[PDB]
Structures are given as structure tokens and as C-alpha cells.
């Protein structure tokens, strides 16, 4: 696997091996973030495994990852849902298409990403990949937003920025 390096505009200019891409000096690259809801409307929140290079052991939205060269955002989402959670989903919908961020985790690892955000519904049970996910919770979106609003620091910084964007929180609030 690789990440896709992006110039100032989001134009692909090359790739980096995924392991080697995330450092204290992470270069801008392409990502996605996705929020998954079951048929009942509950939101899946996941806790990143202790072996993830960036934000290990951090509670976050459902599935995030890195599209490969020539791969659609939506296929990337569908792929990582299968890989991390062993779950089938409905076609991903856009909730925050121009999301972009740069942050630093507690050990100094940086994420630096153009990261369009998607939502989708699960259509099968979860089969957890414990190399990716160490814990998860099915919850009510409203409680998760209250959590993010009251103690944002208990969640990943991108989950927080995403949940607090006017339009994105509005669009997320429909899948319930």
C-alpha cells in the first residue's frame, strides 16, 4: 500500500509507501474518512488499535484510510470497511468533500491530508480486524456529538473537526 502525494492544488504528484509516509514531518497526501451507520441508525465509533502508527488507541469515526492510485474515494471506503471491519456497506455518500487538515498525535506523528468525508450504511455484521481496531461502540449519533462537543480531546482531532462542520454535522444527522 501507498499514499498519494498532493501538490498545493489537490493534484497527485507521486506516492509513498504507507508505512513510511507518516512521520513527524508528514507530507500532504490523499485520504478519506467515513462514518458508518447500521440499519437502525446507530453510528459505529471505533478505537484505533495500539499498533496504528498514527493516533493509536484513539476513539474515532468508523473507518479512515488512503485511496490508492486510480482508486475512487468510494472504492477506497468500501475496501477499508471490508479490511478493517469485515463489513459490507451501501454506496458511500459525500458529507464533507473539501475537508483538509494537519494535526500531530501525542507521540509526534503527523497526519497531513486532503480528506473527503463519506457516510454509508452497513449491510452485514462486523468481523473485526484487531490489527486495525481494538474496540468499538454502536451508539446514538446525538450522544457522540455531545461527547465531541463537551470533551473533544477524547476523540481524534479530525473526527472533531468533521463533526463540528455545520454542513457535515447536518448531513450526518440524516443517517439516523
Ligand X SMILES: C[C@@](O)(CBr)CCOP(=O)(O)OP(=O)(O)O
Beta strand spans in the chain (E): 2-6, 12-17, 29-30, 32-37, 43-48, 59-60, 63-65, 93-96, 100-104, 110-114, 117-121, 133-139
> Is position 88 annotated as part of the catalytic site?
no
Residues between 37 and 96 that touch a copy of itself (CB under 8 A): 45, 47, 50, 56-59
Helix, strand, coil share (%) of the chain residues, nearest 5: 25, 35, 40
Maximal C-alpha separation, the chain: 42
Residues between 56 and 85 that touch ligand X (CB under 6 A): 64-66, 80
Binding a copy of itself by CB under 8 A: which of 35, 37, 155, 158? 155
> Near a copy of itself by CB under 8 A, which window of 89-97, 110-118, 139-147, 160-168?
139-147
Count of residues near a copy of itself by CB under 8 A: 23
**Interface with ligand X, residue 54, by CB under 6 A:** yes
Contacts with Mg ion, residue ranges (CB under 5 A): 64-65
Amino acid at each position: 500500500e501507498h499514499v498519494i502525494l498532493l501538490n498545493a492544488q489537490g493534484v497527485p504528484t507521486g506516492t509513498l509507501e504507507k508505512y513510511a509516509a507518516h512521520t513527524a514531518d508528514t507530507r500532504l497526501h490523499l485520504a478519506f474518512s467515513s462514518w458508518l451507520f447500521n440499519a437502525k441508525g446507530q453510528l459505529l465509533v471505533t478505537r484505533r488499535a495500539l499498533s496504528k502508527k498514527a493516533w493509536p488507541g484513539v476513539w474515532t469515526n468508523s473507518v479512515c484510510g488512503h485511496p490508492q492510485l486510480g482508486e475512487s474515494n468510494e472504492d477506497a471506503v468500501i475496501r477499508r470497511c471490508r479490511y478493517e471491519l469485515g463489513v459490507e456497506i451501501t454506496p458511500p455518500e459525500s458529507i464533507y468533500p473539501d475537508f483538509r487538515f494537519r494535526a500531530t498525535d501525542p507521540s509526534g506523528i503527523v497526519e497531513n491530508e486532503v480528506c473527503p468525508v463519506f457516510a454509508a450504511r452497513t449491510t452485514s455484521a462486523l468481523q473485526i480486524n484487531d490489527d486495525e481496531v481494538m474496540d468499538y461502540q454502536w451508539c446514538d449519533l446525538a450522544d457522540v456529538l455531545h461527547g465531541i462537543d463537551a470533551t473533544p480531546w477524547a476523540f481524534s482531532p479530525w473526527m472533531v473537526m468533521q463533526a463540528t462542520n455545520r454542513e457535515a454535522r447536518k448531513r450526518l444527522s440524516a443517517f439516523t
